[PDB]
Design an enzyme around this catalytic site. Sequence first.
Site, short mmCIF file in Angstrom:
data_model
loop_
_atom_site.label_atom_id
_atom_site.label_comp_id
_atom_site.label_asym_id
_atom_site.label_seq_id
_atom_site.Cartn_x
_atom_site.Cartn_y
_atom_site.Cartn_z
CE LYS A 1 -4.51 1.16 0.30
NZ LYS A 1 -5.55 0.44 -0.49
CB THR B 1 -3.31 -3.26 -0.30
OG1 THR B 1 -4.47 -2.86 -1.02
CG2 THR B 1 -2.61 -4.41 -1.04
O1 LIG Z 1 -6.69 -7.19 -6.09
C1 LIG Z 1 -6.50 -6.83 -4.96
N1 LIG Z 1 -5.42 -7.29 -4.26
C2 LIG Z 1 -5.23 -6.91 -3.00
O2 LIG Z 1 -4.29 -7.30 -2.40
C3 LIG Z 1 -6.09 -6.04 -2.39
N2 LIG Z 1 -6.13 -5.50 -1.16
N3 LIG Z 1 -7.21 -4.69 -1.08
N4 LIG Z 1 -7.85 -4.74 -2.27
C4 LIG Z 1 -7.16 -5.58 -3.08
N5 LIG Z 1 -7.35 -5.98 -4.35
#
Ligand SMILES: O=c1[nH]c(=O)c2nn[nH]c2[nH]1
Lengths: 295, 295, 296, 296
Positions: free
Chosen positions: B6, B66
């Site tokens: 992130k 994330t």
């Molecule tokens: O495709 C995704 N991967 C991830 O790791 C993730 N984390 N939050 N949203 C997400 N979407």
Amino acid sequence: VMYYGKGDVFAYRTYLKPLTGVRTIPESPFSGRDHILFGVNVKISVGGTKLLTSFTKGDNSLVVATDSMKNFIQKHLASYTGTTIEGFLEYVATSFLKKYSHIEKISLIGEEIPFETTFAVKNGNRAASELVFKKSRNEYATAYLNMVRNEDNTLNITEQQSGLAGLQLIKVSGNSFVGFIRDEYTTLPEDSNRPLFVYLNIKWKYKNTEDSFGTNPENYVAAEQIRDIATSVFHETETLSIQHLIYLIGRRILERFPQLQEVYFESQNHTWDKIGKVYTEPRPPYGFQCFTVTQ
Amino acid sequence: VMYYGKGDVFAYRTYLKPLTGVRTIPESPFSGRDHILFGVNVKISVGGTKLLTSFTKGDNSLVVATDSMKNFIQKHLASYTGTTIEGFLEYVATSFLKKYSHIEKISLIGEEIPFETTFAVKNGNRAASELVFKKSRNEYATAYLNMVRNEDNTLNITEQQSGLAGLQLIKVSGNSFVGFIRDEYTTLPEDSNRPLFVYLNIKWKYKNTEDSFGTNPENYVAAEQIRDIATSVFHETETLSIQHLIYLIGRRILERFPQLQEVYFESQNHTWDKIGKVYTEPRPPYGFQCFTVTQ
Amino acid sequence: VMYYGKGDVFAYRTYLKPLTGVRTIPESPFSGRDHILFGVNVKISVGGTKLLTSFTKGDNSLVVATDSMKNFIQKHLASYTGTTIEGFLEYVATSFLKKYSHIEKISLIGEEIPFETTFAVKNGNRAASELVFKKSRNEYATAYLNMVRNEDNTLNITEQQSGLAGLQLIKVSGNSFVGFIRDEYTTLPEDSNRPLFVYLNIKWKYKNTEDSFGTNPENYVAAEQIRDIATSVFHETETLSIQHLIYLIGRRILERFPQLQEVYFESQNHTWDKIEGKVYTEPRPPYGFQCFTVTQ
Amino acid sequence: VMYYGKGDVFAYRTYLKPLTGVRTIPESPFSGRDHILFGVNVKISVGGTKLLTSFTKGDNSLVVATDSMKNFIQKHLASYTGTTIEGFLEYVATSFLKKYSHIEKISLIGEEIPFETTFAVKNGNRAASELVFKKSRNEYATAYLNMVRNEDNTLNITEQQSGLAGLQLIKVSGNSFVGFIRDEYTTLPEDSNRPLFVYLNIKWKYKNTEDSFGTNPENYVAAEQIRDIATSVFHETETLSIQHLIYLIGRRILERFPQLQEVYFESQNHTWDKIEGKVYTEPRPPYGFQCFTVTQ
Ligand SMILES: O=c1[nH]c(=O)c2nn[nH]c2[nH]1
Ligand SMILES: O=c1[nH]c(=O)c2nn[nH]c2[nH]1
Ligand SMILES: O=c1[nH]c(=O)c2nn[nH]c2[nH]1
Ligand SMILES: O=c1[nH]c(=O)c2nn[nH]c2[nH]1
Ligand SMILES: [Cl-]
Ligand SMILES: [Cl-]
């Protein structure tokens, strides 16, 4: 509409005549500018009926090249003997209309490129360097001028406006936004204590345009002083909105500078979302306000 | 390569524990930070063999979202009892690896979001406001940390690096660039007195990683102090190149801070073209230098 | 570390030799490049132990001015007789080391400045113009090269990588993100139909660096074809995550281009927030990202 | 002055009613918009003398929160059943004044967030995807509207303008700039064959604001068609200046669209500097500009 010109004319002048003798105010320590380094970004626009055929016929006979306007501005910064952007714009405007008699009107923007002092150890003690400066991407002074040639061939300033741009202030407490309309579209909670984060552009106009030039520094209004008024009033005020705050800033400016006719505000709201208190950046949509206080 | 995370995790904390007792140096007035307002932009990256099938099979069983890493960072800023970004990163790294045993390695960047004091009139005199601050888009401190989980399940910091980014300095005189190669590709004139304009990113590493955390503030190296060293050395030096300048800055930093192992520089040349002396912005191509001084 | 160089060396060349003779794939109609206009932004880095005193003593005796490097790059773009950024970088690198014997290593980045065709009416019909082009701020091709001088004064490429940068793709439906860890740090809801918006940077490395130059163009891998694979696979796939998607894109790439050794992905998540028709809006700034290599 | 509002109200709508039934021109193959994805960035400004005490006394009794304006815009995008940004702005404006009787005037800007189609292989053939789109940072359509409440509580549009922004065009040859004033301020050389690079912002105003909404789409003027005219005229013309070019573009526009009253131009000059093939590079920052209106 019919005009043309040159933008982003950066020009950096060393050792311009310093600005001295400025009347101080309680909110600001400002008294002048050393002008070791004087940076300005200029935009020039010119108009006149005789420019028509350059558009309608591709006739360049009466076209001052926009590249030549850049040369004109930069050479005139070299020969300017005054002390302010406002006065520099008047010098450019007057010299340009005097030179090119087919031009009826010229508009100029001058934007300060600000530099801050830095520390150097001189022999034994820290002091402000007279050689090394720090380029600032924060707030900066501005100036605007429109000058026209009259039918009797005299030159007249029709509009003048000074300003401070890019001021970004956050007050961690002592702000509320309550009592606004709550209907089917309202999801914002009332907040009796928000960390109000505002962007400000502040612009002022003088009662007498001569005062903008700095010739009598006693009557010149410095962007540095406007800044310190804004922060001072922000500190002193239990704000009830951005609207409320900018009116109070405006009133203080007009009270401190009676030679001013008006102050104009462009504000934006960038207050963080709340999630020890921790906050985070909001989504992109930003509120804004626009408002004129007059003397 | 296999990792994910992130970025742009902005987090603003009010009234963090102040940083006090920092050893001062002659070039800088810095002694601490009030931490009324503590802003940091965090980037987190995590890795580990057990993440493979989230890529190869679309199996999310072992995926910390994330979005959840952002929550993790922002909550931990709320509970951090230390005084530096470096220590905050260690807190996050340790807590994260402790929480998620399938993660083998975590890398963190923390970038200061700097705020400057402003003037307010308190009753009768100007003073620094304790409520209103100015968001600065100029230079800012940085920190970097990589932590891994070992086969014996201990946690180890493998890399740590602090820095100052975005420092933009122009020295109006006392700089030369002469004696460089003149061949068929050389059109740059020698200059015995140029207004050298340099961008600097300065990064340092400690001999003992504990010193970066600020627990014993006597051993902490502040980005504010690095800044003032850079400007001081720039002022003092008849520079012969950017290369020459940054070596001399590096030597001074290592001399002032013997607890440091190395200093790394990323510099860029933005010296204006010459056209009272007036200059203008150059074409876009910029020179750069990269160089490490070691203790 | 010790190196210096020049960045943002923009250079625009007209009427470079066209790229043709390329090998096609199902996902892409790409068949070559006209090269009426060939724009590249170049960054050059050089190193050598003989540069030390330029730092430690201010001795410029062996300094090639970074201004001169810019001249060098632009002059070689005028004389370049090849057909790819990758070949252009090799031309510059080899020429530079041959010219400056005290330099031991050079690293180059070239980034396409892309231009798109436009419409014009002439002689009774509308068609693509051969004169007027539209500057694109969307995705662009990239190239990287590093070259060293050996003890015996031979030159060797030590690393080469091509790429596509700035691809921004949104798929309105047919994407899910469910089954991730739900603990005390989890506020993200499971979503079985999201409008996944990803930024993609895709880089590939060849088994044989010669294939990268265009000299035998049937062995060249075009950024345009890589883009088209990315969009096709995204369309085809009921995505379970960005991680899932990019592995699948990389497998198709290495399947279509057996001359590639590996493909590397930098992805970012910029999916909109959901607020009659469906309406979405921009999210808060924090963005997820992934970095992943697929190898043969 | 006194007004307040909300900016950067991004809103993305899926499956808006398609725009079809439009009238074609020689310069453009434009035949409509699919509207699988309809993105708009909206800015709203409101005024009214009854807002004074919100400034002068901190009284929020009559303040619609700017946050609420964002909600208002996005909710109306979900319910909008028309086919153009211009019609969407009228929908928002009329609804807002009807909702808030103390507001006397509203100004709206909408800027397209454009998306381009992509390729995908399915069921044995490659074709444009109906799911995967590419976000474009190049030119985009714009719309502006101002509406006031009269003393008798009727509402009136007082100004309306559509536009195309961010068009960046380079013509490699067939351009001259000669015969301009040569005096003590002139260092620019005459150039009989330059690669003119112009940024164009083109705005038009209709004789009848109804034609702007799309409700009778045969009378709508599409930004896509305006772009194509601009590129065609640039191709066709041995330009003598940007001034010369934009007047010619504006005349063709008003010739093709007799329902337009005027077209307005904001142009900027970003022509490269010239440094075997011809090579050019980026100039210093200062840019010439022109602003000019052609009227019927
Ligand atoms: O495709 C995704 N991967 C991830 O790791 C993730 N984390 N939050 N949203 C997400 N979407
Ligand atoms: O100061 C504010 N004024 C406003 O109009 C407003 N609307 N939402 N938040 C706001 N804050
Ligand atoms: O300080 C400098 N170092 C350099 O290498 C250089 N090259 N051009 N100008 C320069 N200035
Ligand atoms: O087309 C142009 N118009 C101008 O006014 C101008 N001035 N310099 N170059 C120019 N080119
Ligand atoms: Cl094909
Ligand atoms: Cl047609």
